[PDB]
Amino acid sequence: VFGRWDETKGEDNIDFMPTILSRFDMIFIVKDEHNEERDVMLAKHVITLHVSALTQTQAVEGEIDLAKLKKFIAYCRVKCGPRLSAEAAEKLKNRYIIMRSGARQHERDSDRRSSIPITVRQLEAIVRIAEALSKMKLQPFATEADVEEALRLFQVSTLDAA
Amino acid sequence: TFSQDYVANELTQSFFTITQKIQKKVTGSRNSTELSEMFPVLPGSHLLLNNPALEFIKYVCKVLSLDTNITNQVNKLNRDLLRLVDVGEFSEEAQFRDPCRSYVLPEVICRSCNFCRDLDLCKDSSFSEDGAVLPQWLCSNCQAPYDSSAIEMTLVEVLQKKLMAFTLQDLVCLKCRGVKETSMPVYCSCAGDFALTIHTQVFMEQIGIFRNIAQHYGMSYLLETLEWLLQKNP
Amino acid sequence: MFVSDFRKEFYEVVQSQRVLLFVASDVDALCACKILQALFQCDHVQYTLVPVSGWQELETAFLEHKEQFHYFILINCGANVDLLDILQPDEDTIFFVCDTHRPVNVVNVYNDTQIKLLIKQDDDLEVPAYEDIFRTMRRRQRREWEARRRDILFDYEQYEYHGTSSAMVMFELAWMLSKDLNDMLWWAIVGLTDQWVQDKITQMKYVTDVGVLQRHVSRHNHRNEDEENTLSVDCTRISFEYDLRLVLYQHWSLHDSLCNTSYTAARFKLWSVHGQKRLQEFLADMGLPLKQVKQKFQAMDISLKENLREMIEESANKFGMKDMRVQTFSIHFGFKHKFLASDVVFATMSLMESPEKDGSGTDHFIQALDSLSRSNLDKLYHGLELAKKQLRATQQTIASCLCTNLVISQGPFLYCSLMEGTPDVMLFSRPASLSLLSKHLLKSFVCSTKNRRCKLLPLVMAAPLSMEHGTVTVVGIPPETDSSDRKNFFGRAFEKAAESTSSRMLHNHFDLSVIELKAEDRSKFLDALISLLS
Amino acid sequence: MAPERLRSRALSAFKLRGLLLRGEAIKYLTEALQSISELELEDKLEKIINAVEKQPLSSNMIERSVVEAAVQECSQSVDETIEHVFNIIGAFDIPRFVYNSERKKFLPLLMTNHPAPNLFGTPRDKAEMFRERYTILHQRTHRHELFTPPVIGSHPDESGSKFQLKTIETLLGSTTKIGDAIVLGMITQLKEGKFFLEDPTGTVQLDLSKAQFHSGLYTEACFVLAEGWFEDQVFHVNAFGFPPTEPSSTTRAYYGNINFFGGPSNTSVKTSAKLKQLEEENKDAMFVFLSDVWLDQVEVLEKLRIMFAGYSPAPPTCFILCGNFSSAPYGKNQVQALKDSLKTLADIICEYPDIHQSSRFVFVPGPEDPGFGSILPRPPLAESITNEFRQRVPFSVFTTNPCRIQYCTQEITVFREDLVNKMCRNCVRFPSSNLAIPNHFVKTILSQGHLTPLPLYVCPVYWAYDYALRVYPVPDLLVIADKYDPFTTTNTECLCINPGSFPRSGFSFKVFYPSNKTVEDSKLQGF
Amino acid sequence: AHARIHLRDYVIEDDVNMAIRVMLESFIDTQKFSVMRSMRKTFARYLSFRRDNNELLLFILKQLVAEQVTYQRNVPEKDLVDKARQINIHNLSAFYDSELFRMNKFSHDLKRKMI
């Protein structure tokens, strides 16, 4: 709302409604961190990136070309629909209850409603993220590892809430 | 005050001439397998010194940059002679770093005089006093020595208490910088990773300090402990 | 010693034996290897083939294999050094040496038992006599003879150059055996065209060797064929062509061919902003629409193409490009496969000197060697695409050098240097590609500059090679006059400078005029070179 | 016969068996088998090829050394070799296995993608220590009487009740104020009196005021099966005890013949025919255990003199010097004091041939010793303080504390990094008193299955090598040589002993007969 | 943009120093009055306001003249520009317009090439 996040403002940085915000599985609040070595590495990366425009567009190790990753995403989407395993679902259930209690107590301690609500759609969002992680591997079932990674990604969004 | 500028001009002539002379000589020395081999070694040595005219310029310009607040002509001399060397400013090799890894054992007690004083083990010029290192490590109240046996045992004891501190160190989350409360979690209450409060490279550097000390002064028992502690490593 | 008859004293000897091929990394070497492989596979000769990219890896391979093999064949390597001293062989091995490099080392020539040179005696050879080189007033005359030996042997070893193609030598062997297939004749053609493309021989010698190959082409074209009985489209047909000097012009647009050919790019000065209008004037003089010229050649309208070669020659003559034609050859097979010998040369060369970091140089050798067989036409077409990329990178690098004025006249010789991190320097880090770059850049420079003095100088070019060891690759090139005989002195000038300065020079490439040098020593090395050439 | 014919049939045999010989290998074979007749050559070759196949071959191509070793397996040491019957294994030498939860089995460190242990541990290793302790206890507990209902069990079958374990993450929410729930977790204080329970899923505060303790030494960082209910953000304990133990026979019945203990054998030592037949003739072996061996003062050398006098009859197979060799660890004096006293010990034991040539003199330093401090597993002291002993007493070793002895048919753990009084002085509610103290201590150490069941600041350990301090599967003898009074006891058919502080305890060393599976409760005040 | 102003087909450190100057001067201009002077000396002392470098070419000229006099006693512009290309100080026209050689009594001529 104020351009930069302006960390003292807190919930006043957001003019979005809870209705629209609850429909987002993940809300990455992105802050430009001024660290000196980060800035030096970032500047050298940008300068090299601008310098390298004439290098005949050579292939690269350890990554997928965009044209190939596009086809791979299409293939996985049409082929694989995973589900949660039972123990994975138990893990997700208990972690969700813990996160809900934490969000309630944070709002109570603040005596004000947070702009980001933690709802059953966020539970299903964690489920969807775990299934996407499994679909990358074409596995019919999502494991506790997938649920843990999904919860790790979601706890950035929960950091963004609390 | 003003004579700083006059000597800066005199140096603008003389420093240029001297750097040309040593450059042409040292790069013409055919015995140099590598110009990094040209440099001397002392128990405080750690830098990968490579091209003696550059180190010469760096050291001279450091003392010039600190013996007066008027750094403008010194920075101009840097920009002149680094370009004479054809080494770029703002590169890391153009930055000064202390060639000596100073390490002090504080409050060393002497029985000759009942006095206590601080002692640096890396600073001294070991080549000129290798037999007389312990007389060189005199108590400043007198000229009586501190002995290799006691200092070697002290260094081993320091290694043990330091390694105990490393083992029992705290862990801090990188995102919120609080301390880890209990043992079983792998991540913080947030999604952040934990990190060492006593980083391993600090101990590798201090172990290297102790190793160079022990190699220059022949401390074989300390070298046994150091070699085991170095062998059980990544 | 020189092998008088390849059939009797070389092939019929190694036919009964296990043999080890050391093959150098160049297209002529690859073609000779293909021909010799075909002969050995006909006769069930159990050979082993090892690629070698330099002297040190040749020594390593010989150390690995010397216990198990008694007969060795070196293709485009060995003739210009003392192989006995380099390899330190056992007393009863045999080294057959089929190599284009000249002058042949005198120890190789006058070794009569172990080194056997598969070299035509009618090549450009002037060996000093044995008594001039090999063994008070008596010892005074001994010292005088030794001084005369030093004089004569310097005069012999001064100028390095290239002789008859090894692929042509192996094809003559195949012809004498009467096992010369049409693909073997094509490989011989490709070897000679490799020599011509890389400017290792004079135009007179190239025309003479083309005249030799024309008769073999006619013989193969009348083995089972005449004006009224004709073969399937499956069979290969080699045809003599008085074709255009443009590079790859049947596989991309005529515009790209004119832009990326060294001769026309140099003449029209297309590195400069103004040169594109010169090229447009040339095309307008021809009367070719620019849309057709920029379209791919196979998709160009056929009414423009059936007199295009003579149209190009006619317009080039009045533009001052008096030799746009070249005597060459083409191969057809199937319905759609058609290649000029230059096209196959550039494709195989690019597959060798590819900029890809995956695999290794020996893997790229393997790709290039596979691409010369018609079972790997996909590899050949991939090589053609890589050749288009290589030619474009060559022109961009030439433009960068000339626009930034990196080419500076260092008195006796022009000097240029590529810089680490600049575009395509990794592509040109390899010595063969660097030699081609330096030759093309020298032609471009000679066409660019207006000074009469600069048009006659040779050129020395440096490029980064190593950072783990901090070295550069340095190449020396002779002047680019049409009167030139394609001989250069830089192979000996480099080592004279290196010993005068005690520089850390390493000498791994098979050509003496290419060296590796520590990046610190290049200053004093260049100072010695100016002092030496004077 | 022709050597080419011998070569042809040797190659044919290996090739039909699917194997390729190197040139040097077939050359060795075709000269080694020149004595063989045509009447037996194929039998000889099949014998050799089976011997070759016994090794862990990485390729179908066979090297010279493999054929050589196969012919040696066919001709020499085929029945036994002398050194298998006794070996000494340092803590840093112990192999590492990781328990895969989704395969429910132990995998080697070479098979998992886990990083290799190093002394300067990473932040992950410090967590993995306690997580792995929990993991071992968790998998062990779930296979005891607390196992599945089963889900087939019906009601008339499974008419009786059975425990079901819960994790801390499950008891929050609708599970509040249930009548009976039991949780495995570590017991620890946030502050004095603020007790909590912790597992890899979470942490919860304890109201243990009403807890019926099951008679053990429940310290900080012990793992317990707390039974109670959750309410008002507190777990209210009804009962409180250790997880049940497991014998090594049950452990092997589940996990196979895997060599958890150590040594060169792929299987455990007691599960191979060579050792199983050697133990029939190894009847007369005997070990001696001795702690507070303060040889830096010559009074202890006088004690060693009378020890050699007493036990020259029936020479011991080995002596166990339980560290803390310094009665005067003041400073630099102690180093040369220990060197001189070890020289003296070597000089006196050179006076006999039989003990000198048979008995293994093995040293395991502890805190009051030179070199590395009270950081576990204790590395051996400096080699310059051992070389002179070794060069004239080759039947001796200087190694870690704890240390593992594999006998021909038994397995023993030696440890002296003192903790009995530490266990007593930080019990949650109280210790359990009187002569029962050692029994409660061994119950604690066995149920916890780790030589240090107490916090790191109370007993420091190198993080990545914490697996070396494990007491799972249970050893056959557990020697905990604390400064505490000597004792003997047994639990889950494991013998457990303290040889004690010999100078204080009326000179009470102890001596163990592994072949007889028994020990002497000696007192050498009367020598 | 500065390279395009000079019609260069390739960008050079002249252009980079121009861009650096523009950025630093504008950022300094954004500051308050008291803060502006401290910022000026900060970025001027530490970072690159590369106005000119005449002293290197001055003493290169003096060295070459001293060596030539020593050689002759017991084309100098070509010698000077050769050294000026060897060292990364290629902008020699600035030195030829500056006073530092002029009060030391040197001079130049593109035809005679004597200095």
PDB file of N, CA, C and O in Angstrom, chain B residues 72, chain E residues 21 24-49 51:
ATOM      1  N   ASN B  72      43.855  11.911  -0.426  1.00  0.00           N
ATOM      2  CA  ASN B  72      43.576  12.143  -1.843  1.00  0.00           C
ATOM      3  C   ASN B  72      44.777  11.798  -2.718  1.00  0.00           C
ATOM      4  O   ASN B  72      44.647  11.073  -3.713  1.00  0.00           O
TER       5      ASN B  72
ATOM      6  N   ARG E  21      29.469   8.563 -13.429  1.00  0.00           N
ATOM      7  CA  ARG E  21      29.405   9.949 -12.981  1.00  0.00           C
ATOM      8  C   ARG E  21      27.966  10.436 -12.905  1.00  0.00           C
ATOM      9  O   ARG E  21      27.580  11.096 -11.931  1.00  0.00           O
ATOM     10  N   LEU E  24      26.138   8.801  -9.828  1.00  0.00           N
ATOM     11  CA  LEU E  24      26.598   9.260  -8.523  1.00  0.00           C
ATOM     12  C   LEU E  24      26.225  10.716  -8.279  1.00  0.00           C
ATOM     13  O   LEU E  24      25.799  11.073  -7.172  1.00  0.00           O
ATOM     14  N   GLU E  25      26.358  11.571  -9.297  1.00  0.00           N
ATOM     15  CA  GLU E  25      26.021  12.978  -9.111  1.00  0.00           C
ATOM     16  C   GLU E  25      24.531  13.162  -8.843  1.00  0.00           C
ATOM     17  O   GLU E  25      24.152  13.946  -7.963  1.00  0.00           O
ATOM     18  N   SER E  26      23.668  12.435  -9.562  1.00  0.00           N
ATOM     19  CA  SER E  26      22.236  12.571  -9.300  1.00  0.00           C
ATOM     20  C   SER E  26      21.865  12.059  -7.907  1.00  0.00           C
ATOM     21  O   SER E  26      21.078  12.703  -7.190  1.00  0.00           O
ATOM     22  N   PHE E  27      22.433  10.916  -7.493  1.00  0.00           N
ATOM     23  CA  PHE E  27      22.144  10.402  -6.156  1.00  0.00           C
ATOM     24  C   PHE E  27      22.590  11.382  -5.082  1.00  0.00           C
ATOM     25  O   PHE E  27      21.888  11.581  -4.082  1.00  0.00           O
ATOM     26  N   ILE E  28      23.766  11.985  -5.260  1.00  0.00           N
ATOM     27  CA  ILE E  28      24.228  13.007  -4.327  1.00  0.00           C
ATOM     28  C   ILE E  28      23.258  14.180  -4.312  1.00  0.00           C
ATOM     29  O   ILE E  28      22.983  14.768  -3.259  1.00  0.00           O
ATOM     30  N   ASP E  29      22.729  14.540  -5.484  1.00  0.00           N
ATOM     31  CA  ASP E  29      21.799  15.660  -5.572  1.00  0.00           C
ATOM     32  C   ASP E  29      20.515  15.398  -4.792  1.00  0.00           C
ATOM     33  O   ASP E  29      19.862  16.347  -4.343  1.00  0.00           O
ATOM     34  N   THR E  30      20.130  14.129  -4.625  1.00  0.00           N
ATOM     35  CA  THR E  30      18.902  13.852  -3.867  1.00  0.00           C
ATOM     36  C   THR E  30      19.008  14.155  -2.367  1.00  0.00           C
ATOM     37  O   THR E  30      17.977  14.134  -1.686  1.00  0.00           O
ATOM     38  N   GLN E  31      20.199  14.423  -1.830  1.00  0.00           N
ATOM     39  CA  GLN E  31      20.415  14.474  -0.387  1.00  0.00           C
ATOM     40  C   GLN E  31      20.033  15.845   0.187  1.00  0.00           C
ATOM     41  O   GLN E  31      19.671  16.773  -0.540  1.00  0.00           O
ATOM     42  N   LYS E  32      20.110  15.975   1.519  1.00  0.00           N
ATOM     43  CA  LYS E  32      19.933  17.261   2.187  1.00  0.00           C
ATOM     44  C   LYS E  32      21.223  18.071   2.089  1.00  0.00           C
ATOM     45  O   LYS E  32      22.216  17.624   1.519  1.00  0.00           O
ATOM     46  N   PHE E  33      21.240  19.263   2.690  1.00  0.00           N
ATOM     47  CA  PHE E  33      22.405  20.133   2.540  1.00  0.00           C
ATOM     48  C   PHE E  33      23.615  19.583   3.288  1.00  0.00           C
ATOM     49  O   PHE E  33      24.681  19.374   2.697  1.00  0.00           O
ATOM     50  N   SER E  34      23.474  19.365   4.599  1.00  0.00           N
ATOM     51  CA  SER E  34      24.593  18.862   5.392  1.00  0.00           C
ATOM     52  C   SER E  34      25.020  17.476   4.927  1.00  0.00           C
ATOM     53  O   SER E  34      26.218  17.188   4.817  1.00  0.00           O
ATOM     54  N   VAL E  35      24.049  16.607   4.644  1.00  0.00           N
ATOM     55  CA  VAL E  35      24.352  15.248   4.212  1.00  0.00           C
ATOM     56  C   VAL E  35      25.050  15.255   2.851  1.00  0.00           C
ATOM     57  O   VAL E  35      25.833  14.342   2.548  1.00  0.00           O
ATOM     58  N   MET E  36      24.775  16.261   2.011  1.00  0.00           N
ATOM     59  CA  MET E  36      25.288  16.248   0.643  1.00  0.00           C
ATOM     60  C   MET E  36      26.809  16.334   0.605  1.00  0.00           C
ATOM     61  O   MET E  36      27.443  15.651  -0.201  1.00  0.00           O
ATOM     62  N   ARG E  37      27.423  17.149   1.471  1.00  0.00           N
ATOM     63  CA  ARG E  37      28.882  17.271   1.431  1.00  0.00           C
ATOM     64  C   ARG E  37      29.565  15.985   1.887  1.00  0.00           C
ATOM     65  O   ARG E  37      30.564  15.553   1.286  1.00  0.00           O
ATOM     66  N   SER E  38      29.064  15.376   2.964  1.00  0.00           N
ATOM     67  CA  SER E  38      29.640  14.120   3.430  1.00  0.00           C
ATOM     68  C   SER E  38      29.489  13.037   2.372  1.00  0.00           C
ATOM     69  O   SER E  38      30.420  12.256   2.131  1.00  0.00           O
ATOM     70  N   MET E  39      28.336  13.000   1.699  1.00  0.00           N
ATOM     71  CA  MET E  39      28.140  12.043   0.616  1.00  0.00           C
ATOM     72  C   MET E  39      29.082  12.323  -0.549  1.00  0.00           C
ATOM     73  O   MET E  39      29.594  11.386  -1.183  1.00  0.00           O
ATOM     74  N   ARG E  40      29.312  13.607  -0.851  1.00  0.00           N
ATOM     75  CA  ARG E  40      30.236  13.981  -1.915  1.00  0.00           C
ATOM     76  C   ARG E  40      31.624  13.434  -1.641  1.00  0.00           C
ATOM     77  O   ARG E  40      32.219  12.773  -2.498  1.00  0.00           O
ATOM     78  N   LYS E  41      32.152  13.678  -0.438  1.00  0.00           N
ATOM     79  CA  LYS E  41      33.504  13.198  -0.163  1.00  0.00           C
ATOM     80  C   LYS E  41      33.550  11.678  -0.075  1.00  0.00           C
ATOM     81  O   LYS E  41      34.531  11.078  -0.526  1.00  0.00           O
ATOM     82  N   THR E  42      32.492  11.047   0.451  1.00  0.00           N
ATOM     83  CA  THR E  42      32.407   9.588   0.483  1.00  0.00           C
ATOM     84  C   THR E  42      32.577   8.999  -0.914  1.00  0.00           C
ATOM     85  O   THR E  42      33.553   8.284  -1.196  1.00  0.00           O
ATOM     86  N   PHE E  43      31.651   9.326  -1.816  1.00  0.00           N
ATOM     87  CA  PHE E  43      31.673   8.702  -3.130  1.00  0.00           C
ATOM     88  C   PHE E  43      32.810   9.219  -4.002  1.00  0.00           C
ATOM     89  O   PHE E  43      33.277   8.480  -4.876  1.00  0.00           O
ATOM     90  N   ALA E  44      33.323  10.425  -3.741  1.00  0.00           N
ATOM     91  CA  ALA E  44      34.424  10.943  -4.541  1.00  0.00           C
ATOM     92  C   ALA E  44      35.743  10.293  -4.156  1.00  0.00           C
ATOM     93  O   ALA E  44      36.508   9.871  -5.030  1.00  0.00           O
ATOM     94  N   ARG E  45      36.035  10.203  -2.855  1.00  0.00           N
ATOM     95  CA  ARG E  45      37.272   9.560  -2.440  1.00  0.00           C
ATOM     96  C   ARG E  45      37.250   8.076  -2.772  1.00  0.00           C
ATOM     97  O   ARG E  45      38.193   7.563  -3.386  1.00  0.00           O
ATOM     98  N   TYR E  46      36.168   7.368  -2.409  1.00  0.00           N
ATOM     99  CA  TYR E  46      36.218   5.916  -2.543  1.00  0.00           C
ATOM    100  C   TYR E  46      35.925   5.460  -3.971  1.00  0.00           C
ATOM    101  O   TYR E  46      36.626   4.580  -4.483  1.00  0.00           O
ATOM    102  N   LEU E  47      34.920   6.047  -4.637  1.00  0.00           N
ATOM    103  CA  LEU E  47      34.453   5.588  -5.941  1.00  0.00           C
ATOM    104  C   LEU E  47      34.915   6.544  -7.044  1.00  0.00           C
ATOM    105  O   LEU E  47      35.598   7.542  -6.795  1.00  0.00           O
ATOM    106  N   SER E  48      34.535   6.219  -8.282  1.00  0.00           N
ATOM    107  CA  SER E  48      35.241   6.652  -9.486  1.00  0.00           C
ATOM    108  C   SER E  48      34.623   7.917 -10.077  1.00  0.00           C
ATOM    109  O   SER E  48      33.658   7.862 -10.839  1.00  0.00           O
ATOM    110  N   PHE E  49      35.196   9.067  -9.715  1.00  0.00           N
ATOM    111  CA  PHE E  49      35.133  10.273 -10.542  1.00  0.00           C
ATOM    112  C   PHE E  49      36.495  10.397 -11.221  1.00  0.00           C
ATOM    113  O   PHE E  49      37.373  11.147 -10.796  1.00  0.00           O
ATOM    114  N   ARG E  51      38.458  11.855 -13.395  1.00  0.00           N
ATOM    115  CA  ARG E  51      38.539  13.092 -14.167  1.00  0.00           C
ATOM    116  C   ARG E  51      39.607  13.004 -15.250  1.00  0.00           C
ATOM    117  O   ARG E  51      39.334  13.247 -16.430  1.00  0.00           O
TER     118      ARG E  51
END
